[PDB]
Design a protein around this nucleic acid. Sequence first.
RNA 1: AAAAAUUUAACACCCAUAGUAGGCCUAAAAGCAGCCACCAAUUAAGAAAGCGUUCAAGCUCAACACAAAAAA
RNA 2: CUAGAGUCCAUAUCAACAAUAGGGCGACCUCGAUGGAUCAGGACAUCCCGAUGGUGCAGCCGCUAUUAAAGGU
Lengths: 80, 8, 118, 37, 47, 164, 23, 194, 137, 146, 43
Amino acid sequence: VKQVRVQFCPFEKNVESTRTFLQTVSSEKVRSTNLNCSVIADVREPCVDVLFGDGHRLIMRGAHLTALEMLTAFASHIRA
Amino acid sequence: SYLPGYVP
Amino acid sequence: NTRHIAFSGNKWEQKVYSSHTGYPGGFRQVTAAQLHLRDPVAIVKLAIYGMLPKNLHRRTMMERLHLFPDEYIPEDILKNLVEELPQPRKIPKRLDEYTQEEIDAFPRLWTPPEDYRL
Amino acid sequence: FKNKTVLKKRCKDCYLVKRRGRWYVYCKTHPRHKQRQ
Amino acid sequence: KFTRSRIPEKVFQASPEDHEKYGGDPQNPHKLHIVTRIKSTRRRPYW
Amino acid sequence: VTRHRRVMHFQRQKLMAVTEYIPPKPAIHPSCLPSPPSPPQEEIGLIRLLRREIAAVFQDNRMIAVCQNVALSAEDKLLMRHQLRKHKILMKVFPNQVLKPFLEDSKYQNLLPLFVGHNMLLVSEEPKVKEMVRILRTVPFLPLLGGCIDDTILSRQGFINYSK
Amino acid sequence: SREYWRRLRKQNIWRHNRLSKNK
Amino acid sequence: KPKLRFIERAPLVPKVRREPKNLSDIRGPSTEATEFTEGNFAILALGGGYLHWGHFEMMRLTINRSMDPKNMFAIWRVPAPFKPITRKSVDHYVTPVKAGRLVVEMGGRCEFEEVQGFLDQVAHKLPFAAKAVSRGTLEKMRKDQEERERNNQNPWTFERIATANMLGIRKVLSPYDLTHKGKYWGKFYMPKRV
Amino acid sequence: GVIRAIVRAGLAMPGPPLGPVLGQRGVSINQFCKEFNERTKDIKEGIPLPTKILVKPDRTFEIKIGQPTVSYFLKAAAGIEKGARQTGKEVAGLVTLKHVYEIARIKAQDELQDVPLSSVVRSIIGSARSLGIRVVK
Amino acid sequence: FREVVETTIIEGRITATPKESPNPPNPSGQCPICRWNLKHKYNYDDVLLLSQFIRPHGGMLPRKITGLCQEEHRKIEECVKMAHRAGLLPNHRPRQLNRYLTRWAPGSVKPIYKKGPRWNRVRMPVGSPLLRDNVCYSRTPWKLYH
Amino acid sequence: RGRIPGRQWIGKHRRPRFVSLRAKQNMIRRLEIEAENHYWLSM
RNA sequence: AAAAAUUUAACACCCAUAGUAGGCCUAAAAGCAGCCACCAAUUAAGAAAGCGUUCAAGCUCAACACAAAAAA
RNA sequence: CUAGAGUCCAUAUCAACAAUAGGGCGACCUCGAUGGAUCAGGACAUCCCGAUGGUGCAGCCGCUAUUAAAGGU
Ligand code: FES
Ligand SMILES: [Mg+2]
Ligand SMILES: [Mg+2]
Ligand SMILES: [Zn+2]
C-alpha cells in the first residue's frame, strides 16, 4: 500500500459512507504500520482511490455502499 | 380488500 | 417404499435397536440409521411386530405382511392387489413446488429497507 | 480442556460457542483457558 | 393426631354471588332436602 | 421434618396439583397492542447551556468554519490548537446530535449535510483565510469541509478563492 | 451550571468506582 | 466495632433447659428476627436447618476478609450454638433456624449491589435455601407474593379446602397445615406456591 | 519514547536510580552528566526539575526544560522542608493571594498552553489543598 | 436491495425492492406477522411465510431490519432451521435420510443406549417447545417428546 | 436395571408418582359438587 | 377410581492528554507495599476499579465524541 | 464456592471451612441336612496398548484432563 486518496463533496447526500471511512484509515493506529505511506484528502460524487506498490489499482465508489464493506474490501487486497 | 378478521 | 420412510425429530440417530445373540459379550446395539442402511425393510418389520398381539398368532400374521424397499413389486403380488390405503401423513410441499398462482396469493408481511445489502 | 459444569471466561479473548451440542469456552492467547461442560 | 373436624361457621354464608349462581332464594328457603350418597363409607372414620 | 424430601402421599400430591397458581392471561399480549405514547423527556441543563453559547458563538464571531477532527493524538491536537492560537483562532466543538435542531429552524439550514459525523468548528474574529489554509497545507489528511464567510455559504474552493 | 454538572459527573464515576470494588 | 464478634463452640456453662419440645424448631415460619433492625441488607433463610460451628466460623472467613471498617459494618442475628447433638458410639452444638429467619444483618453508606457480590456466595453454602435480600427486595417479594392471591384464577386454594375439610382430606393432612396453608412441607418452604 | 520523571538539579549521575533504570532503554549514560550540568546553573540550583527527553532509534538526546516542579518550588516559599503527614488537619504553611500572583506567572510557560489566568491559579490551589498549607486572603 | 459487483472497480446498485401489501387487516401493530392475525397460525410447513425472512443462501434477516416480535423472531429462527433440514428449502443452499420436525442438528445428537425405567425414561424430543402457543384443532396437546 | 430399594409403595425410596389430567378433572368435579352442597346447607 | 411432565448460557463499539513520581512512611515503591487528603487544567478523565512492573514502563474500565453424570 | 499453596499468578497442578450430587444398625427369608486350584461371566470409577486437549509441555522423561473395555495384566 502506497497512496490512498479520497474525493467527496459533503454538501450533497450519500457522502456519509465515505466520510466515516476517513476516521478509520486516516488514523495513526493504522498509519504507523506504513509511516512512509501517503494519505491525502481533497474536496470537490463520493469515491476513494487506492494505489499499490506492485502495480495494482483500486477504485471504490461508496455512493450506494457503507463503510463496513469498504473496510473489509481494503483488507482483502492487502494479501496481494 | 381484506376484512379485519382476514387471515392468509 | 419402506426405504423412503421419515422419522419425526432425531429418531434417525437417537432410536436404537438392541439384540443379543445369546453368547457372552453378544450384546449389540445399532441405531435407526445403521439399521436402515443395512436393511431398508427392518424398521417397518420391527414396528409392526411390537404392535401385533403377543401370542402364537403373531408369527402367522407376519406371514401375510410383505415389505419392499423400492417401488418394484413382484408381478404375482401386484396382480392380486385390491385396495390402496391412503397415506397417514400428508407430504409437505417444498418451496419450489408452489406455483405462481399461490405465491402471489400469499401477501407480503414487511417492507424491506431500500439500502439493505441482503 | 477441563470439565467444568459452569463455564467462566478467564480473559477478554475467551469466546464462548456451542459446538456438538455442548457449550465450549475457547481461547487463543491462553490455551489453558479452554473449557468443556 | 387425626380427630374430628370443626367446620368453620363462615363456610355456610350464602353470598349474593352464589345466590344467582345456584338459583336459591334467601328470603324463601327450601322446605326439604334431597340427599344421595355418592361415596363409599369405607376408608372413612367410624363416626 | 426429614432430610430426604419427605416423599408425599398421593392424596396430598393431588391436592397440591389442583390448587396450583394460575396467572391471569390477557386477551391480547400487551406487547402486541398499540403501545402507549412515549412520554417526552425533560431537557437537561447541558442542552440549554450549550444552545446559548452556540448562539453566542454563532453571532459574536464573523468566521465559522467546518472541519473534521480525524483520529489524532492529543499532543498533535494540542499543537494544532497552538498553531491556531498563534493567529488568534479559537477551537470549539459541540455534540452533533444537538446541532441538528439548532440549524434547521434558523437561516443556516444549508449546513445540515455537512454535520453528520465527527465535526470540527473553527471560530475566529476578523477572518483571514490565508494563514489557516497554510496550516492545513502542511497537514494533508485534515480536509476543510466548508463554512460561511459572514453568512455567505461557500465550499472549500470558496475558502481558497477568498484566500488570494 | 457547567461546574455543577462537572461535579455531578464526578459523582457518577465515584459511584461506578465503588460498584467495581466487588466486581 | 464493624466486625463479626468471636463465636465460641460450646456454651461455657451448659444451660440445657429446653423451653418447649424437640424437632419443632425447624418446621414452620420464623416468629422472631423477621424484619430489618439497624440494617439495610441481610440474607434470608428460605428453609429450615441447623447451623454447626463450622458454618459460624465460615461466616467469619468469607465476610470479614471482604470488609472495610471505614464504610461497612456487620453483626450477628442468629444466636450462638446452644442446642447440642447426642452422638452414640459407632458432642457439638447448633442453632435451630426456621424459614424466614435472618442470619446476619449488614448496612452502611453503600448500595445493595456491592454487598450482593459476596453475600450470595455465602448464601449458597448454608444447608438450607437462602438468598441475598435488601430492604427493598424483601418488601417487593412480599408484595409480589401478596399479588398472587388476588390475580389467581384458580377457584380452589389450600386454605379453602384444609380449613373446610372439603373432600374429607384432613384425614391425610396434618393439623399444622391450618396455619402452614400448604406452603410449608417439613423443613422446606416454597415461596413460589400460593 | 516518553520516560517523564523528575530530575534533581544537584545530582547529575545518581547511579542505581538512573543507570540500570534506563540501561535497557539503550541510552548514553555519559550524555546525561555533561549537558545537564550547564542547564543546572542557569537558574537557582538545588531544586527538582522535570525532563523532556525523547528516545529515538538513532540514539539521539533532545531534552527540553521549563520551570521546576511544584513540590519544592511551592513548599520553599512557605518555609517548609518536609511535607505534611495528615494533610487534612496538620498544616504549617501560609501563603497569601499576592504570594500566588507571582508564583503562577512563571509556571504558565510549560506549554500549560491555557490562555486564561484562572486556569493556572485554580490548578495549583487544588494541589495546595492536598498539601498542608493555608490560603490567606 | 443493493448488490455489489466486482470486475479494481466495485459498485453498488438498487434493483426492484419488494413492497408491503397495502391493506393489513389488523392495523396499529408494530409487527410484521403480528399484524395479520398470524400470531399462532403458522408452522414449519408454511414455507411461503418463512421464505420472506431468510437470506438467499439460507440465513436469517436481523430483527432490527424486519422488526418482528422478540419472542416470535425466535420462533421464525427455530421454524426455518426445521424446514431447511427437512428438505423444504432446497433453493437456499449454502455457498441420505428424510426428516421432519427435527429440533436439533442430526450430527450433534448422541444415541440413547440405556433408556430409563418406566418412571425416569429418557424421551426423544420432536417438534419445538417454542410452538406450544400454536393453536391446536385437536384437544390433545402437541406431543413434544416421543 | 431399574430396581427400587425396599417395597414399591412404602419405604424411604418409593416409586415416584405423578398426577394425570383426568385425575385432576375428577377432583374439581367433586369439589364443585360440595360447593353446591355448601350453598344448599346455608338456608 | 383410573394414561407424568420437562430441553438450559453469543454480545458492546470507539476512545484517552494533562497541575505530577499528590504528599508521608519507605533502598526506591509513582493512580495501583501501606497511610492521609481526595482537589484540579482542558470539549472530556478516579489524586484510580482491575491486571503489570524490585520500583518505573506497559495495558483495559470509567470521561468527551459516535443449568452434570457413572456398576457389574 | 476461590480462602490459601504453586518465586509472580485461584483455576499447569495442590487444597481449607463449607455446599450439592452419585455408589453399596435393623432381624424381613432359612433352625424337618475362608484361602488356594480349575473355569471364568460382567462394570469402568483405565494398570498396560490406542486417539486427542492443557501444562510451571525445548527434546527425552513426566503431571493433569477427554475418549476408548477389541486385547493383555
Ligand atoms: S408485535 Fe407481534 S410479532 Fe412483534
Ligand atoms: Mg423390592
Ligand atoms: Mg472412562
Ligand atoms: Zn482466555
